[PDB]
């Protein structure tokens, strides 16, 4: 089997991407944030605290003929940005882009933190990291991908995120028309439950490539590119007037600037992030200070190749017995 679904930016800044997901019978379509940095499929639901729902589409398991309470199971998750959610668990039929899994754990939110409530466009998350991170207790549950894997033509999914435009998540096949040149594959460590890999270095604008190992995670659920402070300082030093602002919470730059590109290494290959991808616009409406899309990972504890980096590439998440990551230009 295979599946193919379009993923769409939630706003003009590509803060996140939503992908329609069919849950239950008859289908209830929710727009989920596919997140390769976590491993829970959770949804706004008929059980969600009413005051914590503000425009989201909800899953109502009582209206699904295939829903079954997973008795005794609870979940609770906290994300790197400080947001969180928790609740109980049903199993139900879940389909993404024509690919159907029966018996998928669908985690129903009883509580969500304010950042979720305030984002009316995201109806939940679909985790695509390794199932060892799944938070369901006392019986850990598998991700949608893990459940689908054995039925897929090839044990892979791909992320092809657009810049200010829709893109695609494919399951079970590599669309050889969706990228240019070759795909370069690189080793993954699953020791922390993430798609963790080592970049071979970086360049700023037209500058020389610095060969240096940068361990980080491929994370579709994180907006920005978080790298070591040395790397990030070298980037922003090439933008006149750019500075790190403790008050704002990172590097800002004059909105009048033209941003240089940023290149990262994948083995001997190079992925170029255009400067425009690094612009996240005014810090507040009408401000001439703009927020940078490359930020320091210091105090996160991990480097994160988020959407800013991934949307510059066609990315293969290879879930074969020995997992790997592939990157191509597009």
UniProtKB/Swiss-Prot annotation:
Its BP terms in the Gene Ontology are: proteolysis
The EC category is hydrolase
GO MF terms here are: aspartic-type endopeptidase activity
| Tagged with keyword Cell cycle | no
Q: Can you give the residue ranges of the Peptidase A1 domain?
A: 17-328
Write the record's keywords in alphabetical order, separated by commas: Aspartyl protease, Disulfide bond, Hydrolase, Protease, Signal, Zymogen
- Cystine pairs annotated here are 255-290
Q: What is its EC number?
A: 3.4.23.22
What's the name of the protein?
Endothiapepsin
Q: What organism does the record attribute this protein to? A: Cryphonectria parasitica
Gene name of the record: EAPA
- In terms of the whole protein, what range is present? 90 to 419 of 419
